[PDB]
Write a protein that binds this ligand. Structure first.
Ligand SMILES: Nc1ncnc2c1ncn2[C@@H]1O[C@H](CSCC[C@H](N)C(=O)O)[C@@H](O)[C@H]1O
Length: 672
């Protein structure tokens, strides 16, 4: 009974172990590499200061996606506080009240007069830290026994001990620690009054950084409503969303992960979306709301900062990052009209016809790998490379049947073979007798330039001419003369290349259109020999921020030696703004568009897979049934399309350390 509550409470307190360690990972790897502009923590001699180290027992390392997300989380809270400190008259006291503070050293980072990067916080800002008693006991003991922390808040720095380890509160002029189980709304309301937070001459900033997330909506809402009664208050909440419901690919994994750790996300079940948070805050007494998800925060970072962030460590998991970012909200509310959400801080805030000719079915293809590539060489299908979860150079031969897909490994006969890789292309050439391997990467800082041909008959690999520039996440397609068009990728090389198979030559065929001034990463690409046209769909740019919302129609003149590729037409649509999608002509007048991720939001059952008639410029939805959406592991990242009917095979994703998901497999067939 009470054992259940105590256990639940301690499990929730334990989530702080994970977040503090992840923040420490960022302090270790990121902050030393970011200039004074976005360092958070530096002294007058340009030397980094550290605060998270006091609260974390070991060196910490996380995946690049996780680190990037935690830097973004640090930036989220700091940016909101900056907006308040910058606008509030400098004679006013500001009190930052951290609700479920865990071991977060933010107050120390901000109050430290050695930290020249927090100078605007040194004079009139105070802090109140609130968490469960048991957790605060530990935090306070650390504060009182660590000289650097004690000095910041004016305590004795000569003590490496405490008289009483059960003390769960702390009082100093600029920092209070106050125990409260936030599920006890009445105790919290009393606490606000004991701290005199009703004083209208004092600006309050309540922060709930993935803390209220663990509480039932009735309990978290009671806290929000209690703070609304304090004149001149802000409420900043940073927590999870499930914008498309609990069965969206990433959402499903996220909810299960938190449940398995006995710290379920309870409030998000009521507040699924950005709009639901606006309505929530309005109802609870905060009329003025500025809210967006984490990708909007990323887009808002200035260029210099973006440039540095990309250079901190190798990264190439943008689909995962899109998904993560759309699952976290940053909501900043106020209860007073005088506070302006200014330009630099402000967040900006369709029913397709259902296709009647084609439908989506399950069709198991447990190749269970991602970011390889595949092509058809006669009646046969060959998939090469990718990761599962480590990179391979293996070739699978696929035999496709209406109901399932058979697979066998192809033993190779040559002494030399291409290194294991992902994000390469693999394209049929040589009248269906060979397969061309272009580029790819090992780790993200290990883009490759070595190209190969695999001969099906002899099962021998041979290395051919290398690219002058490494290139991965490019797209490729076969042309009607048997040559191969190569588009974009992460590369310093030309935006578009043509590989002439017989001549063994690469040619820069970058079209004379301003669209091609920047390399396009993970775009859909296909060419139709019948209508003699091809399409480029979506694609990101090397800023890892911008994604094209264009479908570009182009044509190929084999007899033009200098300018064989020309743009015919550009179509623009929000559902074209995808990174890591694939496209395939179902018919000369019907292009299938599958998957990928978007910077503008999450795809759902109705728009993950759509179809475009490029001539008449019509669009339809190819809906994913409730059944397959809910009951099967879908994840349209790093997948491939094959047609002997189009099979959607391979793919998957690591969901921000909430577990991994493998795309099971789909098939698009004609409706009889
Ligand atoms: N009912 C409750 N009362 C007090 N604290 C709570 C609480 N429910 C959750 N929390 C606190 O919320 C914290 C979540 S971990 C996040 C810690 C901190 N806000 C940070 O971002 O670094 C935990 O320390 C947990 O104990």
């Amino acid at each position: 009974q009470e054992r259940r509550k105590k256990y639940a409470d301690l499990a929730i307190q334990g989530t702080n172990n994970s977040s503090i360690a992840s923040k420490r990972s960022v302090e270790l790897l990121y902050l030393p590499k970011l200039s004074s502009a976005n360092n958070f923590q530096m002294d007058k001699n340009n030397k980094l200061l550290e605060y998270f180290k006091f609260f974390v027992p070991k060196k910490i390392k996380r995946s690049p996606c996780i680190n990037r997300g935690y830097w973004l989380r640090l930036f989220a809270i700091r940016s909101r506080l900056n907006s308040i400190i910058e606008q509030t008259p400098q004679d006013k006291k500001i009190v930052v009240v951290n609700l479920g503070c865990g071991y977060d050293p933010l107050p120390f980072q901000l109050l430290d007069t050695n930290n020249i990067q927090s100078q605007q916080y040194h004079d009139r800002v105070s802090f109140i830290d609130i968490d469960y008693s048991d957790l605060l006991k530990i935090k306070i003991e650390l504060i009182k026994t660590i000289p650097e922390l004690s000095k910041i808040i004016g305590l004795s720095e000569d003590k490496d001990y405490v008289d009483d380890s059960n003390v769960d509160f702390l009082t100093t002029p600029k920092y209070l620690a106050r125990p409260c189980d936030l599920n006890d709304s009445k105790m919290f309301s009393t606490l606000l009054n004991e701290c005199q937070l009703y004083d209208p001459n004092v600006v309050k900033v309540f922060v709930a950084e993935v803390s209220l997330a663990y509480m039932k909506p009735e309990r978290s809402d009671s806290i929000i409503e209690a703070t609304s009664k304090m004149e001149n208050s802000h409420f900043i909440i940073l927590e999870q969303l499930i914008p498309k419901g609990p069965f969206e690919p990433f959402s499903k994994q996220m909810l299960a992960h938190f449940k398995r750790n006995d710290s379920p996300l309870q409030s998000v079940l009521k507040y699924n979306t950005i709009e639901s948070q606006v309505q929530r805050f309005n109802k609870l007494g905060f009329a003025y709301v500025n809210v967006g998800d984490m990708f909007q925060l990323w887009e808002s970072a200035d260029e210099a900062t973006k440039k540095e962030l990309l250079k901190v460590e190798p990264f190439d998991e943008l689909e995962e990052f899109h998904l993560f970012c759309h699952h976290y909200v940053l909501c900043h509310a106020t209860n007073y009209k005088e506070f302006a959400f200014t330009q630099g801080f402000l967040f900006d805030r369709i029913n397709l016809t259902v296709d009647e000719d084609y439908q989506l079915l399950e069709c198991e293809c447990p190749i269970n790998r991602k970011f390889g590539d595949v092509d058809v060489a006669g009646n046969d299908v060959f998939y090469m490379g990718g990761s599962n979860p480590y990179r391979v150079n293996e070739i699978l031969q696929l035999s496709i049947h209406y109901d399932k897909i058979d697979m066998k490994n192809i033993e190779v006969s040559s002494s030399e073979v291409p290194v294991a890789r992902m994000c390469h292309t693999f394209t049929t050439i040589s009248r269906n007798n060979q397969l061309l391997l272009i580029g790819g990467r090992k780790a993200p800082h290990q883009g490759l330039s070595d190209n190969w041909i695999f001969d099906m008959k002899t099962r021998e690999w041979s290395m051919i001419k290398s690219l002058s520039h490494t290139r991965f996440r490019h797209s490729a397609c076969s042309l009607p003369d048997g040559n191969v068009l190569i588009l974009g990728g992460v590369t310093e090389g030309p935006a578009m290349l043509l590989y002439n198979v017989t001549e063994e030559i690469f040619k820069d065929v970058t079209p004379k259109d301003e669209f091609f001034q920047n390399s396009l990463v993970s775009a859909g690409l296909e060419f139709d020999p019948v209508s003699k046209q091809g399409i480029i769909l979506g694609g990101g740019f090397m800023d890892q921020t911008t994604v094209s919302d264009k479908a570009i129609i182009f044509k190929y003149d084999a007899e033009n030696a200098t300018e064989p590729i020309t743009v015919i037409k550009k179509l623009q649509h929000p559902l074209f703004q995808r990174y890591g999608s694939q496209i395939k002509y179902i018919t000369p007048r019907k292009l299938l568009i599958v998957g990928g991720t978007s910077p503008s939001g999450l795809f759902d059952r109705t728009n993950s897979i759509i179809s475009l008639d490029p001539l008449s410029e019509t669009l339809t939805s190819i809906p994913i049934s409730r059944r397959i959406w809910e009951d099967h592991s879908l994840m349209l990242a790093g997948f491939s399309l094959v047609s002997t009917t189009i099979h959607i095979i391979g793919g998957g994703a690591t969901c921000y350390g909430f577990g991994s998901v493998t795309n099971v497999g789909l098939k698009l067939i004609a409706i009889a």
